[PDB]
Design an enzyme around this catalytic site. Structure first.
Site, PDB file in Angstrom:
ATOM      1  N   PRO A 137       4.934  24.184  -5.664  1.00 19.59           N
ATOM      2  CG  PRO A 137       4.759  24.304  -8.050  1.00 19.59           C
ATOM      3  CD  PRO A 137       5.596  23.818  -6.890  1.00 19.59           C
ATOM      4  CB  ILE A 181       9.561  29.113  -5.346  1.00 25.33           C
ATOM      5  CG1 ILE A 181       9.036  29.180  -3.917  1.00 25.33           C
ATOM      6  CG2 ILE A 181      10.939  29.755  -5.444  1.00 25.33           C
ATOM      7  CD1 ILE A 181       9.786  28.238  -2.973  1.00 25.33           C
ATOM      8  CG  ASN A 201      -6.297  35.719  -7.281  1.00 24.82           C
ATOM      9  OD1 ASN A 201      -7.049  35.602  -6.328  1.00 24.82           O
ATOM     10  ND2 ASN A 201      -6.468  36.604  -8.218  1.00 24.82           N
TER      11      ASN A 201
END
EC number: 5.3.2.1
Lengths: 114, 114, 114
Positions: free
Chosen positions: B1, B64, B97
């Site tokens: 991340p 991911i 986002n």
């Protein structure tokens, strides 16, 4: 194509000619003319990787095509190589996000590339 | 991340230990090992939210996997809570986002995660 | 909507009122209320466009909908126009990446827009 490097390495550690080297190497790697390569280096950042403030980089490559499994492995070897050699960042402290942009989703020169 | 926060809050208002707190809490929320969590805080920015220069933040989380409707609600409550407590930013002046990255589109350690 | 401009133009060359102008013009272009528009300007950046360092900009527009071929051409004309008039950046030295965000992939106010 657009390549951005955000790093905690200090500005003085970024060699003169680094933007030019990135431009040339990305033009060769992507096969796109250097006139369409944009590069952006952001040193002195407040960042960590794995909880550590040892040298690291968070990067993006946006391209209209020329993005995929094999191409991105090759880009990663190239760009981790450059960051290791020029900024002394370990490859395992680099993330590169790849974005395959639709031509209609890239603005340039008062319109898009569509 | 990879979590990035851009804010107009000044550098001196970012408390010591904040990147570590973000790393730890993101590891727990995403389930990922802390060694894979990267965090980046960019204070002192020229930005507005709703036309106002009151404290605000524009953020991204790339991962991911571990991205989705319910997960992203939980991330937003966590991250807005940290930005409110630590940087005194109102949650309604925060945008995050979220990006679910394909493993083939993340470079790391001279290759990708595919 | 969220608009970010990264530029090598110096901070003193960013005119007073610019963030308000961006907010106003993006509210009208996107049709979204100005209360929902966020803007971010990052001057003094180390960047090159096409191998040179004459004024340039690398930008993003993230929006929940209101993204598409014709809309993005209109946004590009508007935004290149503002960057040319206000920051004296040539439109052919501007890249704008457009992102159509799913509502569930935007955090705000402790939750998402879903």
């Amino acid at each position: 194509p657009m390549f951005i490097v955000n790093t905690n390495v200090p500005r003085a550690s970024v060699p003169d000619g680094f933007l030019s080297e990135l431009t040339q190497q990305l033009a060769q790697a992507t096969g796109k003319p250097p006139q369409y390569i944009a590069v952006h280096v952001v040193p002195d950042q407040l960042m960590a990787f794995g909880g550590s403030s040892e040298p690291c980089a968070l990067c993006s490559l946006h391209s209209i095509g020329k993005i995929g499994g094999a191409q991105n492995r090759s880009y990663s070897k190239l760009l981790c190589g450059l960051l290791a050699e020029r900024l002394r960042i370990s490859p395992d402290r680099v993330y590169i996000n790849y974005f395959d942009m639709n031509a209609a989703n890239v603005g340039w020169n008062n319109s898009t590339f569509a």
